[PDB]
Design a protein around this motif. Structure first.
Motif, PDB file in Angstrom:
ATOM      1  N   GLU A 114      55.681  12.010   4.843  1.00 55.35           N
ATOM      2  CA  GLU A 114      54.295  12.402   5.078  1.00 55.35           C
ATOM      3  C   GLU A 114      53.434  12.141   3.848  1.00 55.35           C
ATOM      4  N   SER A 121      47.292   5.978   3.657  1.00 57.45           N
ATOM      5  CA  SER A 121      46.139   6.157   4.534  1.00 57.45           C
ATOM      6  C   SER A 121      44.852   6.316   3.736  1.00 57.45           C
ATOM      7  N   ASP A 153      40.237   8.272   9.341  1.00 57.15           N
ATOM      8  CA  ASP A 153      41.587   8.065   8.823  1.00 57.15           C
ATOM      9  C   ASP A 153      41.731   8.619   7.410  1.00 57.15           C
ATOM     10  N   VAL A 156      42.361  12.057   7.819  1.00 49.91           N
ATOM     11  CA  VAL A 156      43.723  12.258   8.308  1.00 49.91           C
ATOM     12  C   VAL A 156      44.705  12.278   7.144  1.00 49.91           C
ATOM     13  N   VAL A 160      44.853  16.149   7.646  1.00 48.29           N
ATOM     14  CA  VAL A 160      45.838  16.295   8.715  1.00 48.29           C
ATOM     15  C   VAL A 160      47.254  16.307   8.152  1.00 48.29           C
ATOM     16  N   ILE A 161      47.501  15.529   7.105  1.00 49.80           N
ATOM     17  CA  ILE A 161      48.837  15.429   6.523  1.00 49.80           C
ATOM     18  C   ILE A 161      49.115  16.620   5.605  1.00 49.80           C
ATOM     19  N   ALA A 164      49.712  19.273   7.786  1.00 50.99           N
ATOM     20  CA  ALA A 164      50.950  18.975   8.494  1.00 50.99           C
ATOM     21  C   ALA A 164      52.178  19.306   7.658  1.00 50.99           C
ATOM     22  N   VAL A 185      43.080  17.994  13.525  1.00 54.36           N
ATOM     23  CA  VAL A 185      43.738  16.788  14.023  1.00 54.36           C
ATOM     24  C   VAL A 185      43.244  16.447  15.424  1.00 54.36           C
ATOM     25  N   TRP A 335      49.999   6.650  19.595  1.00 53.51           N
ATOM     26  CA  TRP A 335      49.593   7.995  19.974  1.00 53.51           C
ATOM     27  C   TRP A 335      50.170   8.483  21.294  1.00 53.51           C
ATOM     28  N   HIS A 366      50.557  10.081  12.856  1.00 53.59           N
ATOM     29  CA  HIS A 366      49.893  10.139  11.560  1.00 53.59           C
ATOM     30  C   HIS A 366      49.887   8.788  10.861  1.00 53.59           C
ATOM     31  N   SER A 369      46.908   5.849  11.119  1.00 52.89           N
ATOM     32  CA  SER A 369      45.778   5.893  10.198  1.00 52.89           C
ATOM     33  C   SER A 369      46.005   4.976   9.004  1.00 52.89           C
TER      34      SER A 369
END
Ligand SMILES: CCCCn1c(=O)c2[nH]c([C@@]34C[C@@H]5C[C@@H](C[C@H]3C5)C4)nc2n(CCCO)c1=O
Length: 383
Positions: A114, A121, A153, A156, A160-161, A164, A185, A335, A366, A369
């Motif tokens: 990740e 990203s 992105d 993200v 998001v990461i 995450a 997200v 996705w 993920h 992105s």
């Protein structure tokens, strides 16, 4: 073997702390040395995967070496009839126990991967934002959709990461905090869907009605459409916070234990989000139909460009159309796995998925992105 030895250490330690004469102290200490030596050769149930010489085992045996040291001191004092100092050296054993035996391999790979997908990203999409934004000749509508998508992105990789990772280590937080972690997200994914659809529409306008294109797609309309995409992404995104969640079951299990107030949970993704929202609303409405419409649009664009064959403008529009269709196809491909996992969750709650495939699905979702700027720069090198 290890558990009973541990409880003999505990009970016998309490025997020394409740002893009256030195014979009880010496006897209990002998028992504790026997159990400690017998448990030094054991392996804790938590450390099934770690190698026999891994640092956890050496810290374990090391702590037990210190333990047998303290036991031997207390015993050497007990043989001399000094019950006081023997009980003191018995008091140190609780501290030595606190420092050591009072305290992730498959998971660490997920965490590191990740972090990698973040490190790919963020800078790449920032680079796209640079290449389009700083250049003044790149103030188009499709370019504006590209800029917004690259922003998505970037967020993200930057939001998001990191969330995450914090959802994977799983801290005990309030219920609503888990929603505030879960929504971004959703928002950003819907924003990417709408951005890609907007690129498709702009292509169809550039290939069907070029004669008046620049006079129908005003930059004002570009800003209005982009703002509309963001607003749709927030409405579809913040829907769980509006009240559509699995707060009923969590609060019911919270009251069944007698406690009352704000529920506190592990903050898993599956417990805070209703799968009816993911499947019926977020997917069957705000994912699948836009994908189908993009398919029809790109089919029409390729059809018009094919029938229309100065030649250079239409060939260029054909290259850009190829790149756009490819990027959209890679989005749907990267996705669909996670969505299908949601659907299997809603339709068969009994069927449980192997974790590895879920980790893969998240790696795709993920990772797209990070996949976008690579393909984009590649298609710049093509044209
Ligand atoms: C279009 C936007 C998609 C949004 N989304 C999901 O749809 C999503 N489904 C899941 C799963 C995986 C496993 C089986 C089912 C229930 C839970 C647990 C499927 N996890 C998701 N996550 C977060 C992942 C990292 O923790 C997520 O962000």
């Amino acid at each position: 073997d290890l558990e009973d030895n541990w409880e003999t250490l505990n009970d016998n330690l309490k025997v020394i702390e409740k002893a009256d004469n030195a014979a009880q102290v010496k006897d209990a200490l002998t028992k504790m040395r026997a159990a400690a030596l017998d448990a030094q050769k054991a392996t804790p149930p938590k450390l099934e995967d770690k190698s026999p010489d891994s640092p956890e085992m050496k810290d374990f045996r090391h702590g037990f070496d210190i333990l047998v040291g303290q036991i031997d001191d207390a015993l050497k004092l007990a043989n001399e009839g000094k019950v006081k100092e023997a009980q003191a050296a018995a008091e140190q054993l609780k501290t030595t126990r606190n420092a050591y035996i009072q305290k992730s391999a498959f998971q660490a790979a997920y965490i590191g991967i990740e972090v990698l997908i973040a490190l790919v990203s963020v800078p790449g999409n920032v680079l796209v934002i640079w290449a389009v934004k700083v250049n003044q000749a790149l103030r188009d509508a499709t370019f504006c959709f590209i800029v917004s998508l690259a922003v998505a992105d970037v967020l993200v990789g930057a939001l998001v990461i990191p969330l995450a990772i914090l959802i994977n280590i799983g801290p005990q937080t309030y219920f609503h905090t888990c929603l505030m972690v879960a929504c971004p997200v959703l928002i950003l994914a819907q924003s990417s869907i709408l951005a890609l659809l907007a690129i498709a529409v702009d292509r169809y306008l550039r290939v069907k009605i070029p004669l008046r294109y620049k006079m129908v797609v005003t930059p004002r309309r570009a800003a209005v459409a982009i703002a509309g995409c963001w607003i749709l992404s927030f409405v579809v995104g913040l829907t769980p916070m509006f009240g559509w969640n699995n707060l009923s079951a969590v609060e019911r299990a919270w009251a069944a234990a007698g406690s009352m107030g704000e529920p506190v949970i592990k903050c898993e993704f599956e417990k805070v989000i209703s799968m009816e929202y993911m499947v019926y609303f977020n997917f069957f409405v705000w994912v699948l139909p836009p994908l189908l419409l993009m398919v029809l649009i790109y089919l029409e664009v390729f059809a018009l460009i094919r029938k229309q064959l100065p030649q250079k403008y239409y060939g260029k529009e054909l290259k850009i159309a190829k790149s756009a269709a490819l990027i959209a196809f890679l989005f749907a491909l990267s996705w669909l796995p996670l969505h299908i996992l949601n659907c299997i969750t809603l339709f068969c709650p009994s069927c449980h998925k192997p974790s590895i495939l879920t980790y893969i699905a998240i790696f795709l979702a993920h990772g797209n992105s990070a996949m976008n700027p690579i393909v984009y720069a590649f298609r710049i090198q093509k044209f």
